[PDB]
């Protein structure tokens, strides 16, 4: 029903956005490791 769709859409956007930002934080870690390897190879 209507309120069921309200609750479901709220949970949808909550869990999908939380997965999105979790993956971008792991992307941040990948960027950090990549420049660490870059500077280690240059030195």
């Amino acid at each position: 029903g209507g309120l069921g769709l309200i609750k479901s859409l709220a949970e949808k956007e909550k869990q999908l956005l939380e997965r999105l930002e979790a993956a971008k934080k792991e992307a941040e870690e990948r960027v950090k490791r990549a420049e660490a390897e870059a500077k280690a190879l240059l030195e």
């Binding site: 029903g1 309120l3 309200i6 609750k7 859409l9 956005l17």
Partner: protein
């Protein structure tokens, strides 16, 4: 009354856009906002807002182009194309029509302004053909009044008397009082003459802004050129309208559909790349809604949830849901507001009683035959499938409403001819010639149940029939109100209806006991129980719905005798007119029966056109005043079932 269940769907944003286009194609469901909880307001896009503004501007330009073309907004099949190509097609015809209309309006104004001062400027130029623009003399010309030239020549005598050539030659529509002396002294004398009342011929454009002979030549050229130009402009405008009206109508239909989809997208609810829609739809369209949802992208969740209960149904829509035998009275039923979606649909009692009361109102069989002739005329007009157009009435009616009116007129005229056979009256009193009714005063044919002329044996029975019909309608309305109060579990209105019924019953019993006949033993406990039930419901309510309310309900019950009153009045009028006509025709000469019958038919048609509107309106007004108001029917006015349009 329909069930009107709740219908919901969901999906992604553009998926909801496609499904909303599909739901606008099968527009059998009204929507709802439900913006409040745990979602966005679904402000779609600024690009979507700009595209909606562009399509709305295209629709407004198409409407203005149809208005300038003179055609009306008639719906048709849409034109499926892109917005840019449709705008490019619309703008060409709109620009051509706008330039043609501007040129036509300017040429008509120029022709009118030239004709307003055509001959007088020519006469003044012929009089002043020696000093037109000479640099020594200004010539104040004035289209002045009648032959009072000394009144304006007093200022010329106040100027140099043997100077200042000042006269009015001809063209008596306005006397061309031209005064020519100089520049400065003539300007002072022109100010003095305007103080005496004068005005220089300074027209707009260039004719009142150029030298006199050149402006005369240009005005003569415009007068010789304007009519063929206006005729060719009207011809080219008619050709452009006849060549572009169908394309403009299809573009207006497609633009109205796109603007409807754009405005309906505003009522959506966004879920951060998620969307849903909720609304109402009738239970008889669940298969149509399922077939519309069959074309969904992933067969989205068509939640056919139930409607609300007897309480808390406020934004729920409303529909008729009546029998097809009673489908024609829908316009008369919907002339008022809507019910409370759980209120009693009273449309069936309208076809049950308004025809039965209306036949008792009008009992003229000749008027029924004239109504059959007018209904055959309206049926031929509806079979021609043209819109019913009445310019002095400003009444434009579709063929469905005209067909419903014809069906209601037939259903009225059947019982009307039945009651006219019961009244024994055909076109007034045609029985004065051939006694189709059988009276004991003069037996001509089979006997009439009602002679409808005398009231010594008729008035008491007619008043009793009207009172019984009104009491039955009042009791049915009170019972319907009590049943609706029991259904809604609101015991205030239920106790009010039960007490009103008991008070009306006790009032009728005590009236028939005291002011009526003898034998006051059987109804004595009836009147006592009625007064006791009235007092007990007043104690159980304590709402101060006092004896004024009971007297108003009793007057609404007793007002049903107006039907018999109007029927007797119309019968007496028609019988008097027909008797006077037949007497002055046959008994006075028996040879002016042609002219006498023509004058009698003219007077009968005049009396019919004068009284039949009120005679037909009084029964429906009494029905709307009794059956609605006794059952309430004046609470919150309902909410309308407005689905997606697809206006076509």
């Amino acid at each position: 009354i329909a069930p009107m269940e709740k219908l919901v769907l969901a999906g992604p944003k553009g998926r909801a856009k496609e499904l909303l286009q599909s739901l606008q194609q099968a527009g059998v469901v009204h929507l709802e906002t439900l913006r409040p909880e745990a979602l966005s307001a679904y402000q779609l896009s600024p690009e979507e807002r700009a595209e909606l503004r562009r399509w709305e501007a295209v629709s407004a330009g198409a409407e203005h182009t149809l208005s300038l073309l003179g055609l009306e907004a008639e719906p048709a099949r849409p034109f499926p194309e892109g917005l840019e190509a449709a705008e490019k097609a619309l703008s060409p015809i709109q620009a051509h029509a706008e330039g043609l209309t501007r040129q036509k309006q300017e040429l008509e104004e120029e022709l009118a302004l030239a004709q307003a001062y055509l001959e007088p400027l020519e006469r003044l130029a012929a009089l002043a053909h020696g000093l037109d623009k000479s640099p020594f003399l200004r010539v104040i010309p004035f289209l002045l009044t009648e032959k009072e030239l000394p009144l304006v020549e007093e200022a010329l005598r106040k100027a140099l008397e043997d100077r200042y050539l000042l006269a009015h030659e001809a063209y008596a529509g306005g006397v061309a009082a031209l005064v020519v002396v100089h520049r400065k002294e003539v300007d002072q004398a022109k100010a003095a003459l305007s103080r005496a009342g004068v005005a220089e011929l300074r027209l707009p454009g260039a004719l009142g802004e150029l030298p006199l002979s050149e402006a005369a030549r240009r005005l003569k050229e415009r007068a010789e050129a304007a009519p063929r130009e206006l005729s060719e402009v009207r011809q080219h405008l008619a050709k452009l309208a006849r060549e572009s009206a169908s394309t403009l109508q299809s573009l207006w239909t497609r633009a109205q559909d796109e603007v409807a989809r754009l405005k309906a997208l505003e009522e959506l609810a966004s879920g951060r790349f998620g969307f849903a829609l909720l609304g109402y739809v009738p239970v008889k369209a669940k298969p149509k809604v399922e077939e519309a949802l069959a074309r969904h992208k992933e067969s989205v969740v068509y939640a056919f949830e139930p409607v609300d209960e007897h309480h808390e149904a406020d934004r729920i829509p409303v529909v008729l849901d009546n029998p097809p035998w009673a489908k024609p009275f829908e316009l008369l039923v919907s002339f008022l507001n809507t019910p409370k979606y759980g209120t009693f649909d009273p449309t069936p009692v309208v076809p049950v009683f308004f025809p039965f009361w209306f036949g008792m109102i009008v009992g003229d069989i000749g008027y029924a035959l004239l109504f059959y002739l007018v209904g055959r005329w309206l049926s031929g007009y509806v079979k021609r499938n043209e819109p019913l157009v009445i310019d002095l009435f400003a009444l434009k009616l579709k063929p469905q409403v005209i067909g419903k009116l014809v069906h209601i007129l037939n259903w009225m005229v059947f019982w009307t001819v039945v009651w006219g056979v019961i009244y024994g009256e055909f076109f007034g009193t045609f029985l004065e010639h051939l006694g189709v009714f059988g009276t004991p005063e003069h037996p001509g044919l089979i006997p009439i149940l009602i002679h409808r002329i005398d009231t010594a044996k008729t008035a008491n029975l007619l008043i009793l029939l009207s009172v019984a019909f009104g009491v039955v309608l009042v009791f049915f309305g009170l019972a319907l109100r009590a049943y609706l109060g029991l259904k809604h579990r609101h015991m205030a209105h239920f106790w009010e209806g039960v007490g009103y019924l008991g008070g009306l019953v006790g009032v009728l019993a005590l009236a028939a006991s005291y002011l009526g006949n003898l034998q006051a033993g059987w109804l004595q406990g009836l009147m006592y129980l009625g007064f006791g039930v009235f007092l007990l419901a007043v104690l159980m309510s304590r709402i101060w719905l006092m004896i004024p309310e009971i007297f108003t309900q009793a007057g609404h019950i007793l007002s049903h005798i107006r039907i018999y009153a109007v029927g007797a009045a119309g019968g007496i009028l028609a019988g008097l007119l027909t008797d006077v006509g037949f007497a002055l025709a046959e008994r006075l000469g028996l040879l002016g029966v042609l002219l006498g019958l023509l004058v009698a038919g003219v007077l009968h048609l005049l009396i019919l056109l004068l009284t039949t509107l009120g005679h037909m309106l009084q029964p429906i007004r009494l029905l709307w005043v009794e059956f609605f108001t006794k059952f309430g029917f004046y609470e919150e006015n309902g909410r309308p079932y407005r689905p997606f349009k697809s206006v076509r």
